[PDB]
Structure 1
Amino acid sequence: AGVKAYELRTKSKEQLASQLVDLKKELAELKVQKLSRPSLPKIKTVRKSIACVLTVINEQQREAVRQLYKGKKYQPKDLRAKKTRALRRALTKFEASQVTEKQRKKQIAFPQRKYAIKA
């Protein structure tokens, strides 16, 4: 069998919490059986289910925080884009495009003119 992710995302914060204890209780018991039976592949499925639950609990507690920070300076470092340490500190497009006031008047008055040679 085994738990499906898209079905977990509809369960409540406290519903998934109790699913997890149910799966743990389940997995705890199976380990007792494993040392009698000379195989127990059903156990792989329940420990994958636990993993699949914890992801979902985490996914939702994260997208909670991610939005109540969404749109403002200073959100936590692990919700910021990873990118690269260098890309991280590269000049933003705004302070790149920045141009001196004197420079701006020159780009305006004498831009590179489109032209061609025939006549």
Structure 2
Amino acid sequence: AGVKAYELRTKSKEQLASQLVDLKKELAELKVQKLSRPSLPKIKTVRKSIACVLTVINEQQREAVRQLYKGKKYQPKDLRAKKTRALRRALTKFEASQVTEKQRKKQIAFPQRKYAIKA
């Protein structure tokens, strides 16, 4: 078998928590069975299911927070973009585009003209 996330994401907060507690009894039992047996591969699909649930339990809690920090200075550093440490401290487009009032007047007044040769 093996539980599928897109179904878990419709389940509720505490349906998921209870799912989990079930799967863990499930596992616990299997482990007792395993050592009375030549092999027990069902165990695999149970323990990848615990994975999936945790994955999806943690999935929702994260986008809970991600959203309520959406659009403010300061959000937990592990929701901030990751990029690259250097990148992360490069100037912003704004800071970089920044231009001296005097510089502007000149840009405006004498811009690079489009032109052609012939006559």
Query: TM class by shorter-chain length?
Result: over 0.9
Structure 2 Cα separation of the partners of residues 25 and 70 of structure 1: 38
Structure 1 Cα separation of the partners of residues 71 and 12 of structure 2: 26
Structure 2 Cα separation of the partners of residues 36 and 106 of structure 1: 86
Structure 1 residue 53, shift from structure 2 partner: 0.2
- Identical pairs, percent: 100
Residue 31 (structure 2) aligns with:
31
Structure 1 residue 52, shift from structure 2 partner: 0.3
Structure 2 Cα separation of the partners of residues 53 and 22 of structure 1: 11
Deviations for 1:59-84, whole angstroms, at most 9, x for unmatched residues? Answer: 00000000010010000000000000
RMSD of Structure 2 on Structure 1 (CA): 0.3
Q: Which of structure 1's runs of 4+ aligned residues deviate more than 2 A?
A: none
Gaps spanning 5+ residues in structure 2: where? none
Secondary structure class of the residue paired with 2:79: coil
TM-score, L = length of structure 2: 0.99
Gaps spanning 5+ residues in structure 1: where? none
TM-score, L = length of structure 1: 0.99
Residue 18 (structure 1) aligns with:
18
Deviations for 1:31-65, whole angstroms, at most 9, x for unmatched residues? Answer: 00000111000000000000000000000000000
